[PDB]
Design a protein around this ligand. Structure first.
Ligand SMILES: Oc1cc(O)n2ccnc2n1
Ligand SMILES: [Cl-]
Length: 115
């Protein structure tokens, strides 16, 4: 079901290495629905190439547009398990500190802060 489950550490590492070669200015982001989630829909896809100049606040807006949410639906975006200290951080900076050893940046979303 989950991304890490579907691909070998070997395969995830090699995909990231190719995204580096073919999409050198993009951050490779896995975005997954919380296994508990009941309200929000599932994304059309799992793997995202996010432009490296956008801050986390702009990535939250991109995904809420991808989910086609309305303004009073709730949406939380956990990076690397935990809450973000700050949505003003550039995703280039968040990548360099929160990236997995496979080189993806993992995120989960829910309607509740209590995931
Ligand atoms: O939409 C939001 C708002 C937040 O404060 N966070 C913190 C981590 N992920 C978030 N997503
Ligand atoms: Cl590029």
């Amino acid at each position: 079901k989950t991304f890490k489950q579907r691909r070998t550490f070997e395969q995830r590492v090699e995909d990231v290495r190719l995204i580096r070669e073919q999409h050198p200015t993009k951050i490779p982001v896995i975005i997954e629905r919380y296994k508990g989630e009941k309200q929000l829909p599932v994304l059309d896809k799992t793997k995202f190439l996010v432009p490296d100049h956008v801050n986390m606040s702009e990535l939250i807006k991109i995904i809420r547009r991808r989910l086609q949410l309305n303004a009073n639906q709730a949406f939380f975006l956990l990076v690397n398990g935990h809450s973000m200290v700050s949505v003003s951080t550039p995703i280039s900076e968040v990548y360099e500190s929160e990236k997995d050893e496979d080189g993806f940046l993992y995120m989960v979303y829910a309607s509740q802060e209590t995931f």
